[PDB]
Design a protein around this nucleic acid. Structure first.
Lengths: 93, 97, 78, 105, 108, 90, 97, 78
DNA sequence: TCGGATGTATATATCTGACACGTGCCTGGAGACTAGGGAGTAATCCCCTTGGCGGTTAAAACGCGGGGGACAGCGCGTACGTGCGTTTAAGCGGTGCTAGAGCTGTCTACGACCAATTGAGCGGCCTCGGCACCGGGATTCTCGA
DNA sequence: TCGAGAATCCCGGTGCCGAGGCCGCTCAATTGGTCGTAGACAGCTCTAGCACCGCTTAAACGCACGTACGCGCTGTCCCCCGCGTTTTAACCGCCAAGGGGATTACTCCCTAGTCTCCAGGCACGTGTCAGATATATACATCGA
């Protein structure tokens, strides 16, 4: 039973933000369920967007539109900006 | 001078507007409102007639549902008139705010 | 503005369809506000849908998809 | 020699795992190269905001370890995160302490 | 070479087994689709359509009309206690609302 | 363009032989059929993903029907589905 | 020989159970109720302690939200004590019949 | 008769957590009824998931799925 | 407004049990190369959406009773807080143990997949009967008396 | 009770346009073969859910007394309904155009696919400190 989770990555994010804090096990299980829910939500919206336009590929445009649809205003703007920044840096290197 | 008692001309029209399946809002002002609201999102937009018709139908259904809920709220407070506090009560219980 | 195009008789007719006997004077402005909020919410999603398709026309599919997104599925348009 | 896609994008969340989950989820026939990067970036930003609010809410209680109660407080207190997670129940989270003004004497 | 008997006729249905199978395959629901899944789904859809159309026709007959209109659909959905909650989050265009006036509001 | 129009018309005539249906009512019926189809198919796919299954069979559709249809509706729907599946297999 | 005036002990409690997160319902009675309810669906059906705890917490949260909604409905009616009509109004506005 | 196992002070505690000052007598019975309805609805889907899984034990993940299908997403169990 | 008596954080020692850190290994994520198919680009061209003009009038805006309902005040008696003894049962700890979930090993029947091929379903054209509408009449609420 | 008045159902006659049927006529659903493989089936393991059993104690409860307030009654008064009068812009029909939403043809480049290897992250073991808990103290408040 090789169970996969987001423990290490979310811990890295916390150390990036708050270097002197920790996550309890129940709180970390809640984090994992939050990230899984958001991931499946965005992926489902992107799949719906691709199927609505007779398109058979999930690209960055679909994820951008999905995150613009689901997240609230300033959250959507910040998420879109950060995602575009990450995509450009990945493309450059 | 025959004067109908205040109140009968309410339930009378209520039977009519519940028996009918019209849209109860003038189409041109609602289309203008939709164009104005969408102007704040993208400049120089075009709307299909089916799109504005669907928007009008959805707003119609939403508003009649909200009016039913606020009527229930006003009845609960031992009143007949609907007042805005009933509106925010219904919208808050419905999870909108 | 154009929110005043939703006239007082229109609000009265909507309340009558909802089954309301007496309307207070403050109902009309609040109804206009909530209608504006709902229309903004739906139109934001519809316009984002029509941007994603690289289109400058808002079709009925965009509107019905936006309505379905807020759990307000609409039958009769495609 | 091998460099992970997460580091190549300057990110912490796994781009490879996100790509594999996009393939495995039957979401679409094909997955673009940059779609997992964008999705991982969005998830990383959301987690960063959630962890920041959880951390400073926990520090408000003089606790250096974040518990589900701190998560609930952080999510409910923020306007936009509350809207995003309005229909979400956090286990062992509780509710915001609020009493209506009429109830007070 | 034998006669091309349709799958819907083979299953004694009216909804398309082949079209539902194609939509299930192209809908990206699963990597593979079983043989009996389109038949089962077509049967369920046909039963639901039959129930909706039966109640709509009854409502139309109550209105002395022969052709079915969206108002009859709305009446059929909102009068039944199960189709209403199945379709509680949907709106029927031009269907209106079912007549209902609260007893408190009535005079005397 | 794909539409259940002839199919809904056939079902109507089977149930109400002397009853017509308007174009708007037919469109609403088509929208209802599409909505129920996508809902049941999504639930079946979700079940297959939960149970680590790569295919959707009559079991997944049956469980999706039982989940998405309340009470008597689910019972009669699964009855008709089982009848059709048994007729098709034989 | 003193006595706390009505109203203060309600808040000494409302604050206590709002600032602290607990389960507020005894584990074994709720587990027995869950098993009794599940008996009507499948016979001799086993459960997991994690599933029982999840049902526990979900029920707690559901009732807490319902109680906030019904409290607000009661306050709307110029009242303080919550009546069953308040619960019925909240459930009807939320759409839960 | 385990519906009475949810005692009156339990409903009182839940109301206090929700922020309620005074309680009527019928509140206990009404809350028992609504809780019974909610548990019946959730457990029906949980048991259906268990049936489709060919299992005889209701895991917490099935309860999470049943709650998610009902529009009440649950975090902290998977 | 205060003597005073509570459940309100505050100040400090003791376990202690979850938490974060070595660790190792195997398995999924990177590099490397093909190809071939989904998708961007280009042209086009025809639908349809925007725009605006004139006529009709149904609908909206406005003003004026005035009456019925929203709201404030009082009385009451009735149900709902509060200590309290108890008794009722609920967590808390320990073990038995066994149905049952989870992982393995065949291998078989079932699901793609591709080459005809054909009939069922879709697009366009009548075409007439359902239904909308109008106009006069019988019929049914209504509200002052 | 009741009758003039005002809606309201009803029925006959007229029109007109969508529902329905028919006729080509593509294209995608059917047949029929292989080809691989998902899970069907049987089996072994070990694990955690069920049952008991007793203990100690939280709390549920049934019962009293005081009283806060939910509700009904009285009264006021005010604002919203009903109707008549006066705009007015919504609606319908029409015409013009341009623009952009679908299409068809052509590359083309990007990702699925397959082979190889390695490093990272997850299961395991473990020393450690964040925090619950026990004990005594400042302290914002119901009655005269």
């Amino acid at each position: 039973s090789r169970k996969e989770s987001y423990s290490v990555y979310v811990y890295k994010v916390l150390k990036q933000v708050h270097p002197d804090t920790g996550i309890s096990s129940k709180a970390m299980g809640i984090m994992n369920s939050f990230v899984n829910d958001i991931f499946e939500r965005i992926a489902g919206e992107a799949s719906r967007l691709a199927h609505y336009n007779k398109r058979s590929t999930i690209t960055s445009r679909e994820i951008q539109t999905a995150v613009r649809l689901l997240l609230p205003g300033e959250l959507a703007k910040h998420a879109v900006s950060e995602g575009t920044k990450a995509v450009t840096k990945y493309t450059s290197s | 001078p025959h004067r109908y008692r205040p109140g009968t001309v309410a339930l009378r029209e209520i039977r009519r507007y519940q028996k009918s399946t019209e849209l109860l809002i003038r189409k041109l002002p609602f289309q203008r409102l939709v164009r104005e609201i969408a102007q704040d999102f993208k400049t120089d937009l075009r709307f299909q007639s089916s799109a504005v018709m669907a928007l009008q139908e959805a707003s119609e259904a939403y508003l009649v549902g909200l009016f039913e809920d606020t009527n229930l709220a006003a009845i609960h407070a031992k009143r007949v008139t609907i007042m805005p506090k009933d509106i925010q009560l219904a919208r808050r219980i419905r999870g909108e705010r | 503005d154009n929110i005043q195009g939703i006239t007082k008789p229109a609000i009265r007719r909507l309340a009558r369809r909802g089954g309301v006997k007496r309307i207070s004077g403050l109902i009309y402005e609040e109804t206009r506000g909530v209608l504006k909020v709902f229309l903004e919410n739906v139109i934001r999603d519809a316009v984002t849908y029509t941007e994603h398709a690289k289109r400058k026309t808002v079709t009925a599919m965009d509107v019905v998809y936006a309505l379905k997104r807020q759990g307000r599925t609409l039958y009769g348009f495609g | 020699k091998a460099k992970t896609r997460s580091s190549r994008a300057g990110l912490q969340f796994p781009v490879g795992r996100v790509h594999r989950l996009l393939r495995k989820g039957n979401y679409a026939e094909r997955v673009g190269a940059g779609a997992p990067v964008y999705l991982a970036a969005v998830l990383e930003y959301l987690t960063a905001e959630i962890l920041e609010l959880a951390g400073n809410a926990a520090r408000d209680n003089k606790k250096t370890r974040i518990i589900p109660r701190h998560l609930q407080l952080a999510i409910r207190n923020d306007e936009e995160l509350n809207k995003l997670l309005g229909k979400v129940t956090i286990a062992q989270g509780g509710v915001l302490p609020n009493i209506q003004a009429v109830l007070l004497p």
